[PDB]
Ligand binder design. Sequence first.
Ligand code: ATP
Ligand code: ADP
Ligand code: ADP
Lengths: 370, 370, 369
Amino acid sequence: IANQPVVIDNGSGVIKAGFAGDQIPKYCFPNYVGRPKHVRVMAGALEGDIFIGPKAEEHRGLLSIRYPMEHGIVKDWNDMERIWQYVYSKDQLQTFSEEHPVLLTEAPLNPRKNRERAAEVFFETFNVPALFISMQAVLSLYATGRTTGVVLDSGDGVTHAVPIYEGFAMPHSIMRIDIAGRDVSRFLRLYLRKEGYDFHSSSEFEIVKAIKERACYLSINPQKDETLETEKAQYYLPDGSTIEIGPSRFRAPELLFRPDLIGEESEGIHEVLVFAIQKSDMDLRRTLFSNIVLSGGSTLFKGFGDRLLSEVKKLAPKDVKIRISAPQERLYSTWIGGSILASLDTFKKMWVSKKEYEEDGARSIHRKTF
Amino acid sequence: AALVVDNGSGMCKAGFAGDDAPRAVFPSIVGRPRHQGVMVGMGQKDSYVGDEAQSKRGILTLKYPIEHGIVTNWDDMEKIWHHTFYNELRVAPEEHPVLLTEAPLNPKANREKMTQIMFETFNTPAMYVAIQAVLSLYASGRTTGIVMDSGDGVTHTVPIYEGYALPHAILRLDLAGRDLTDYLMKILTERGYSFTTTAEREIVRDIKEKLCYVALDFEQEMATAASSSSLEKSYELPDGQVITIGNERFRCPEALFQPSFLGMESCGIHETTFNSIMKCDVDIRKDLYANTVLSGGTTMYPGIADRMQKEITALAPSTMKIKIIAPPERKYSVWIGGSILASLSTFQQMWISKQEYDESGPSIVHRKCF
Amino acid sequence: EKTAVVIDLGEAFTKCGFAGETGPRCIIPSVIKKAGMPKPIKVVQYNINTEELYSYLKEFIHILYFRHLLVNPRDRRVVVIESVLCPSHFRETLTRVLFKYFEVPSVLLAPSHLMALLTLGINSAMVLDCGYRESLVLPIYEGIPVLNCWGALPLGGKALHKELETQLLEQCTVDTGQSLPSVMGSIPEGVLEDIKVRTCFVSDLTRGLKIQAAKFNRPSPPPNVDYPLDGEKILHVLGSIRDSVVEILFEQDNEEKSVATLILDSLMQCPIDTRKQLAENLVIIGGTSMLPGFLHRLLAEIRYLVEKPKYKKTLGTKTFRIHTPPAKANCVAWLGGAIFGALQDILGSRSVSKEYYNQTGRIPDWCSL
Ligand SMILES: Nc1ncnc2c1ncn2[C@@H]1O[C@H](COP(=O)(O)OP(=O)(O)OP(=O)(O)O)[C@@H](O)[C@H]1O
Ligand SMILES: Nc1ncnc2c1ncn2[C@@H]1O[C@H](COP(=O)(O)OP(=O)(O)O)[C@@H](O)[C@H]1O
Ligand SMILES: Nc1ncnc2c1ncn2[C@@H]1O[C@H](COP(=O)(O)OP(=O)(O)O)[C@@H](O)[C@H]1O
C-alpha cells in the first residue's frame, strides 16, 4: 500500500524508529529490559513489568532492568517481542505492520540466526509487506551528506571504523570492536567500589549512567591530573547522595585508548582505526586523512578529541596535520539517513516483500542482503 | 662436530650431524603475559616462550616474534635462542659451528645483524646459514627439482637444475597458513563464536590442521553440504562447546588457490608455480613436471596434490607427464637435510670463522652465507 | 632478626600475628569500646572524620599489642593485609597512624586471597571468599588474581543479624522475665548472636524446598536447633528460621543472586584456559561463612544450577572437588600471612618503609604510579 512506510531504527542502548517523512523520531526509547525484582506475591500484575518511559518512571520496587541486546550481541528475543509489540501497540505510532512497509538496519559481524529470528517475527507474527535491512554508518553519511570519508562512530556498546570513498569499503578494511559506554558505567561503579558505596543492582547502574552522561567529563593529562588536586564536586540523588569523585570522574580513556591497563586484551580506537586506514591505498589513504567522518553517540566528552589528536600526531606521517573534528551530538544521524533513504527511490529496489520471504526467506534475505 | 639448528617462525628444531630426529621441537613464538598493576607474590618469568608460554597459555600471549621473515625483536629472539640452547642441549656455542637457515627477500642487514650478534653473543668457532629449499631437495635426492615452501608465513617456488638455478626463476610469495588462521577465525566468529586472545588462534590452528582436507569443486561440494549436512562434522573443544562445520574445513585452504577470498591482487599457487616453470628452458620444464617436488609444513593436507596436478594438467599439454614428489615429512626434512649437509666434510671445510667478521666485516656474509 | 605484624582488614575482627607463627594468637572484635562509651565505635565508618578515628586507632593499636604481647613495634615490620573496596583514604589514614605516629620500620600491603592460596601454595585456584558483609569469587590463576572476575553480595554476617532481628522482632515466642510479644524494641545483640553463632548448622535442600512451600500455601520444622537464652526468658521455637536465612541467602526469585551466580559470572569472563582448571579448583574457603553442614545445600545448589538452560552451554558437564582447608575457622589468611611474612626478609625491601614515606607519604594503588 502507498502509505508512509514505517522506518524502524536500532540501537544497543538507544533504539529508535519512525516513518519515511518524519523529521523526528517521536520516542527516544532506550534499549533495555523491564522486569520484577522479586516474585510478585500477588498474581495478575503488570506482567513482566513491561514499562516504557513514564511507565519505567512509575515505580521502582519490583523492577530490575536489563539489556536484551548486550553490546549489540542479542541473545534472547522475548524481550524484543514485547518491545516491538509495544511499538506496534497503538501508543507509539498507532499503526500496523501491514499498513506500512518497514525499513530497518542491522549491526555487522553477526550470525544469520539473528536476521532469521527477526524476519520470522516481522512476517509470521506481524506482517510487514515490504521490509529492508541496512547498515548504520551509511545513513550517518547521508545525514552528513558525505558519500566518501573515513567513517568512524561508536554506539552505546559498539565501536566501529569504516574507510569509505563513494560508499565503497573493503570488508578487510572495515574494522569494529564492540565495547563502549555500558562497560564504562560498569567501571564507574567499579571506581566507586574502590570508594566504597552502594552496590546492589541495576538501579545504581541507572544512577551511574546519569553520572556518566551528566556528572562526568574527560581531561587530557591523566598523569598530571592524577597528580593534581581538586575538591571533587558532588551530586544529589532522590536521597541526596553528596558523593565526591575525582580522577574517577574522568578515568574513561583508560578504557577507550588504554583499556588494556585494566588487565584487558584490546588495542585502542585510534590504533585499529589507523590500521584500517592503512589497509587502504596509501595515497588515497592520505587524501582520506583530510576527511575522516568522526561520530559516536557515546564519545560525548570534551578534550577526548584532543587526546585522539595526540594519537594522530603519534601516528600521522608528521607535518601532515589533522586537526580536531568536534561533532557534539551523534544520535539521530542514522535515523535521519534512514528517513532520507526510505524517502527516496532506494526502498523500491531495496525492499523485502513478504511474498518473496514466504517463497525463500533466508535465501532471499541473503541474496538481497547485498 | 656441528650444531644443527633448524629454524622457523613457528617450528624451530635442533640437533647435530647424523641425528635423524630433531632434539629441539617447539613453537618459536614469544609469549607475553598479562602484566597488571596490582601486587602479587612469588613471581614468574618475565615472559615465557613457546612451550613455556603454552604451559600457562591462560595469561601468556604468544605473539609473533617474526612476520614472514620480519623479526620483531632480536633481543627476544636471542632470549628464545639462549633459553632453547640451555633448555635442550645446555651446551656452550663455542663447541662447534652453528647451523641456521633463512629465506630470500630479506634485507642483507638482517642476516648481517643476525650473524653479527651470533658472533657477539655466542662467540662460536665458525657458523653457517642456508636456504630451507636447498636442504629440501638435498634430502630428497636431486640436483634438479622444483619445490615450494609453505611454512607458517612463507611461500616460495624454487626450481633447480643440476644444482644450478636462477633467482629470476625462483619465485616467492611470503604468505601461508597464518593468514588462513586469521580468515578461519573470523569466519567462525561470524558463525557465532568468541575469539579475542592468542589461545583462540592456537585452538583454531589446531582444529585447522585437524580439518583442512582438500576436496575438488566447492560448488558441488557446497551443493552436497547444503543437501546433506552429514559432512558438517562436530567437535567439542576443551571447553564444553561443540562446533559443527563441513564446508569451512576444506574450503579454508581454497584461498591458497584463490586470493579472491582475501582480495590480494595475486595469482593462484598453481599458476604462480606455473609461471615459475615458465621462466625456464623448454626441456627443463618437462623435468619440472617430472621433478614436481613438494615441501612446506602447511602442505600436510590431503587432496591438494591431485588438485595442483589437475591444475597444471589443464595448463600444460598432455605430453607433459606430471610426476608429483609428495613427501609427508617435508617439515622435519629440512633439519634432516641440514644434518646430512653437516655430514659432508667439504662443506664443513667451508666456513664462516671469527676473523672473517673481525677483519673482513659483514661483506663475507654476502659472499659466503650463500 | 625478629618477627613481624600480621593484620587484615576485618569489619568484625582484625587479628594480629607474628612471622611464621604456628597457631593462632589473639582475636578481638574490630569495634572499639572505651571508657564512658555507651556504644562502641566501629571500623567501617566511612565519610567520617579522621582525627577522632585517628586517635581511636592510636590508642587501640597501643593497647592492642600491649594486651597482646606488650611488644615494641618500632623494632619490627608490619604485614598489612587488604580487603578490597575500602577507600584508600581510609587505608592511608591507617598508614598515617602507623608511620607518622608510631614510626614502625616498614609496612606492607598484601591480599588475603594470597594467604588463602598459600595454605596450599598452588598456582591456579578459585576464590571462595565469604567475608563478613560480602563475598568474592576473584580466582587466582597461576598465582595471579583474576581482575574482572569480581562481585559481592552485601548480605554477610551483619545483615544476617539484621535478618535475625527482623524475624524475631516480628514474633516474640519467648516468655516474660506470659510471653512479652514484641513488648520492647531493643535487643541483646550479644545474646541474639550467641544463639545464632552457636547454632549455625545448615539443613537439607529438601527442607529448604519445604520452606519455599511454606512461603505460599511446612513438613515438621522441629527438631529445631537454636541455643539457650537469658534475661529470665528462654524458649524452644523453630530454629528453622536460620534455614530460612540460608534460603534467602541464595535468591533466584527474580533476583538470581547467589554464590554460584558469581561463579557463573566468573565463568562468563573465564576463557577456555580457565574452565577445567577451575572445575579442578573447587576451592573451599570463606571467613564468616563457617556454616556447619553447608556442603549439602551448597553442593546441591551448585549441581542444581548447573542444570540451568542458559548455563549448560556455558558449563557443559563440569565436576568439582573439595579443596579442603588445612587451616581453621578464619586463621586461613591470618596464618597464611604469618608464614608468608616469615622468611620474607627478601620482600622486606618490598615492605614500604617510613623512610620513603617521609618524602612520599603516599602508597599508590591503580593510579598514575
Ligand atoms: N602436521 C601438520 N598438519 C597440517 N598443517 C601443519 C602441520 N604442521 C604444520 N602445519 C602448518 O605449518 C605451519 C606451521 O609452521 P611449519 O610447521 O610450516 O614450520 P615453520 O615455522 O613454518 O617453518 P618456517 O617458518 O621456516 O617455514 C602452520 O601454518 C600449519 O598450518
Ligand atoms: N554524555 C554522554 N557521555 C557518555 N556516553 C553517552 C552520553 N550520552 C549518551 N551516551 C551513551 O551513548 C549511547 C548513544 O550511542 P548510540 O550511537 O545512540 O548507541 P545506541 O544506539 O546503542 O544507544 C547512549 O545509549 C548512551 O548510553
Ligand atoms: N559455625 C559457624 N557458622 C557460621 N559462622 C560462624 C560459625 N562460627 C563462627 N562464625 C562466624 O564467623 C565470623 C568470622 O567473621 P570475620 O569474617 O572474621 O569478620 P571480619 O572479616 O569482619 O573480621 C565470626 O563473626 C563468627 O560469628
